[PDB]
């Protein structure tokens, strides 16, 4: 997260850390949607260009964390993965289209002051909140700048950008399965997600019920926090059909 700030304790209880067992290292962010399911970016699990092709056994998730580098005893909880599910239409060759994946926890995690799930949007919420100018929030333990790592979870609020502006901002082919966010140059302020934050949630608070909804997943960008450029996020609602299918046939 570039130009963000330290998150407060319990501020993002659905924040999940994807960790590699061997060698031991931080891989990506993720989000908790229930006591047994975790959402993340597909390329965090499958991306040949970086020679990454993980299986359930290579990974581990750490929930309820704040510190990036320390084991937070009695606070954070660790879970093994029972199964990983990558979107069958995920495109890693071209533009990271449908960059989403689901992870089932081997054993349900217990909720606490530091562990609580986020909500997934319905058609109305999505249509209402996901509009240019409305702001969402991104969190993660990723890099502080394009060109190093924070000690605690970082947070930053960013405005949703208009699709034509997202499209004209890059030569990369964008799709309806993504949306972009970030300040425009003529706006002064800045902030962005960065390498290491992928998989993390882009959330919005509904003014209707005061609940937090995950509208996106940190996916990609071109550099971090450059002028005239915007971060891209997987449009979660647009892929809900797949989220529902996977959970329906592999959940129990």
């Amino acid at each position: 997260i570039v130009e963000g700030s330290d998150a407060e304790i319990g501020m993002s209880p659905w924040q999940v850390m994807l960790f590699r067992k061997s060698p031991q290292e931080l891989l990506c962010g993720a989000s908790l949607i229930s006591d047994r399911w975790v959402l993340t970016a597909a390329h965090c699990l499958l991306y040949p260009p970086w020679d990454k092709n993980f299986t359930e056994n290579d990974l581990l998730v750490r929930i309820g964390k704040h510190s990036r580098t320390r084991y937070e005893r009695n606070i954070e909880k660790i879970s093994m993965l029972e199964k990983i599910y990558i979107h069958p239409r995920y495109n890693w060759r071209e533009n990271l289209d449908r960059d989403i994946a689901l992870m089932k926890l081997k054993k349900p995690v217990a909720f606490s002051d530091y562990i609580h799930p986020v909500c997934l949007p319905d058609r109305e919420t999505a249509a209402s909140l996901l509009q240019a100018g409305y702001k969402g929030r991104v969190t993660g333990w990723g890099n502080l700048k394009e060109t190093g790592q924070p000690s605690v979870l970082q947070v930053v609020n960013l405005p949703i950008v208009e699709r034509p502006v997202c499209k004209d901002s890059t030569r990369i082919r964008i799709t309806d399965n993504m949306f972009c966010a970030g300040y425009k140059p003529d706006e002064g302020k800045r902030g962005d997600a960065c390498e290491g934050d992928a998989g993390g949630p882009f959330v919005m608070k509904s003014p209707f019920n005061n609940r937090w909804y995950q509208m996106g997943i940190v996916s990609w960008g071109e550099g971090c926090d450059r002028d005239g450029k915007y971060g891209f996020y997987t449009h979660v609602f647009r892929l809900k059909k797949w989220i529902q299918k996977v959970i329906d046939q592999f959940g129990e």
Binding site: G10, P13, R36, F111, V118, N209, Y213, E252
Partner: peptide, 13 residues
């Protein structure tokens, strides 16, 4: 199949 937690989703302790 979803597990529990959806009913009280999005509200921070």
């Amino acid at each position: 199949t979803f597990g529990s937690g959806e009913a009280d989703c999005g509200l921070r302790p």
